[PDB]
Amino acid sequence: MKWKTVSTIFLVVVLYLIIGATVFKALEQPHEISQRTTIVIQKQTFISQHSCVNSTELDELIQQIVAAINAGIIPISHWDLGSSFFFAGTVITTIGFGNISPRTEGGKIFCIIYALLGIPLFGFLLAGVGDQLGTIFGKGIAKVEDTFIKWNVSQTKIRIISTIIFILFGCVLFVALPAIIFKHIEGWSALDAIYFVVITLTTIGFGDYKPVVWFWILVGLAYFAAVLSMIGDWLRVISAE
Template sequence: MTICMRKSNVRLLVLVTFYLLYLVMGALIFSAIEGPQERILVKELQDKRSLFLKQHECLTDEELEKFIAAIVQATNRGISAVRNVTISEPNWSFGQSMFFAGTVILTIGYGRVSPLSEAGKAFCIVYAMIGIPLTLILFSAVVERLMIPTTMFLKFMFRKLGHLYKVFHIQLLHLFIIITLILLFIYLIPAAIFYALEPNWSYFDAFYYCFVSLTTIGLGDYIPGDSPDQQQRPVYKVATTLYLIIGLLMMMLLLAVVYEIPELNIGFHFFMRSDHDEERAHLQPSTHESGLKYSKQIDEDTPATSEYQGVPGFQRTATYQQEAESAEIH
């Protein structure tokens, strides 16, 4: 048992090492790509500042510094200084507030708009403590029901293709179809809509916003409806909130579909319970006349109509086999 436990610990140590190296690699690449752009922007701002002071000799550098600091502080609190700040719609109108509430309980958290008062911060804590678990419960229940038509479609594919292809190949085709539909209706089409509605966004910016939001990264560098000229801003914000909810549901559905394919469930090999399966596999008699093998060693030549037993994360029902055999007969 100790030896088996060491195997999972070694795999975990390798994973931790790779994870740290991945972080370091990401830091180096981001620094190499973004560093020169930052230096160019700093140089441009320094030149503009010097030119502004030359054109307005009555203004001292210290006064300009205080003014810029006030502008930056207001921007960080979600108040734009573009044009007249009194023209833009308040950040805490109903539409804006609903958008903020959605980003809190969906754990996106853009950070562009945040509570200003102590009472607002305290309520945000309580609201998130209740809303985040509630969101997880709701999403889990909805995804469970969405898996019903998804599984029915997989059964249909088994009936039509089960006598021709292996189980794993059919599951991969099913996953590819799901990914294609999500990419089209959750990323590409919404990105085109954002591109049409946002005056300063390119299509890539819009697609980038969709990806960063639906992966709950939420950098906050792009937020829909922040343009001063945005028409029907409250309605736009509410519609965006609904989009985020639907998009995150689809992402959870995609993860559920991936989890149903045992060959893609790589994380299982790093769990402690994987050691027990390996131990049971070693205890199997090697000369057994039925040729029993470890359940995770799937024969590449086995057709999709065979039964896979004991594979973690994969529940193969007798219905699949019966339907595939029936399709073969007809």
């Protein structure tokens, strides 16, 4: 890649971040202001309903929870075998964590080595998953492409339907399916469920929150890898234009 292209893409990225900074402030800062009043009211409500507790003592209890969260414990275990397996999973997938992370010197030393060896290893698995699914999808798309060719239909119409099949696959497993699960377990809206899924499978990560579950995460990460690769290809078309 030429240096002239690198400086142009850098400028587009800086511009895109300014657009992001402007829209996020516009959509999120007024709600945060109103949520400060929600806190103040809920605080004044607690002191009124529990007169034996005063504002200074309530602030002392909040700072203890701050100390606990800073110590790496949310006041159910975080470092049991099962929870440690999911934690090791968020490391090698690069999804990450919020406040629950190693706090010991040895735990930090191991996490550095574990990530450096594990992230390439999981990328190898994910590369193979995407390739296996791509062959399964490619064989299915070939039967549809052969059928539409025999009944004389244009190539532009053939690729248009192939994109609908790809979007529907993502709509079923990563839009509709989690909207049903997260509305039953957590009671979240379709948008709160879809937001959780996009953020997890792009590996941005949600912060702090058996065979079919790990299979869904693997196919999901493979699917969004293909989605972001396709959007990347679309950006190469816009750049050439």
